[PDB]
């Protein structure tokens, strides 16, 4: 069982997301301090295009996927599902813009 | 010295309320204990509020809000009304 975090794009097991949260998005999402509904709304088990990154700084792939400022690990090219309107508004309150990874937005 | 108690005041209040009723000595002991207990509760809570708010004076507001905390609804309302009335008339006089 593995899920792909919608915001940062990292892929981790769903139980890891529930118990410890997203190591990168915890500053703005509080996934560890969030219930199962919010975890499902921000981490999706349906994804495609597994990506393993070793060096975020110099990898052009990481810059192209906007994951060069995040923790190395499993990443997904495309994630099924989008963030809810309330979570998007909450992120806009923090000043961070959310760019969907669903592929439908380009 | 001559021990202090609220016995004469309870007689006064009783005659004000029930002119044709009397109180036993033990019931007066209970009433004195009750009055002392309530005074202790209210003064302790007033001190707690004053310390909570970094104040060094007990004013009628602290006593009023202590009564608001301690007494239940109707009791608090009537006792607050009585106290404000008495304080207003003492100030006026």
């Amino acid at each position: 069982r593995e899920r792909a975090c919608m915001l940062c794009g990292i892929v981790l097991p769903g139980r890891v997301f529930m118990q410890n949260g997203c190591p990168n998005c915890d500053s703005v999402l509080n996934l560890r301090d969030s219930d199962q509904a919010t975890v499902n709304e921000c981490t999706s088990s349906s994804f495609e295009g597994l990506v393993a990154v070793g060096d975020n700084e110099h990898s052009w792939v990481a810059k192209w996927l906007r994951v060069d400022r995040f923790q190395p690990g499993l990443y997904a090219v495309r994630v099924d599902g989008r963030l809810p309107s309330d979570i998007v508004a909450a992120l806009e309150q923090y000043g961070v813009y959310y760019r969907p990874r669903d592929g439908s937005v380009i | 010295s001559r021990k202090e108690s609220y016995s004469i005041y309870v007689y006064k209040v009783l005659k004000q309320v029930h002119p044709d009723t009397g109180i036993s000595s033990k019931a007066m002991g209970i009433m004195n204990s009750f009055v002392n207990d309530i005074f202790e509760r209210i003064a302790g809570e007033a001190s707690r509020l004053a310390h909570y708010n970094k104040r060094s004076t007990i004013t009628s507001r602290e006593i009023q809000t202590a009564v608001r905390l301690l007494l239940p609804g109707e009791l608090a309302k009537h006792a607050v009304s009585e106290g404000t009335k008495a304080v207003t008339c003492y100030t006026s006089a």
Binding site: - | R2, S7, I8, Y11, L14, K15, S24, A27
Partner: protein, 273 residues
Amino acid sequence: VFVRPAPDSKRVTGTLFIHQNGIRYQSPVRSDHRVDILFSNIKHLFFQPCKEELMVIIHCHLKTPLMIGKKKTFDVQFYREVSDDEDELEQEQEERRRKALLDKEFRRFAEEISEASNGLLDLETPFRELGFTGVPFRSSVLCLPTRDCLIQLIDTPFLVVTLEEIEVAHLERVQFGLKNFDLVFVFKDFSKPVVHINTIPIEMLEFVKQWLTDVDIPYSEGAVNLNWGTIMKTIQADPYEFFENGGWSXXXXXXXXXXXXXXXXXXXXXXXX
């Protein structure tokens, strides 16, 4: 309609029919599981709508006991059950519609039973606002007053106390700051066993005393659970000698009879120093 007590170990729905001199319950699965109840044998006819209940009830309390299957019973109950954020609030509104539908139909049927009796049977309904909680048997239940009876019909075994058959009520365990009390009904027929209602909350004491007075039932209060197995057998042995020596009127002893008090302090309502 479901019947209690059931004529078979299997719970089966049936049809209730009104006839010229009584009612007939008839199961669709077996013709032999008919229950016939004559109007002449019904003592009390109760209806109870779903005011808080998952069920609607038509209860027949009988003068003479009937043999339903293997059980002798004074009580025959006919019943049906309703049981099966805005969406959950709307599902409660749909349950409230289903309650009102079954309530209207079963009330109408119980009135039609009363009409078919040619005025032999009055339709009684429980006054829910006058209800109090207590333990007549093994569970805490809401006891409901009616016009002529004190009832509990939701759980088996059923309680049906006719108010006119009561000789005296005794309130046991009533004393200084007590948590709960018991209520005992003694009947005019001393051969009938006394009925206990236990753990009535002490908050309901003054209400129960008022209600007993409004119904013309004498009451007495006691700190101790008096034994009635002893009291009744002595009263059955010689009822005349019992009343000769004061019956229950002397036992009541309402007069406080307290003058000793606890003395008094020097009565002085004067400011000292």
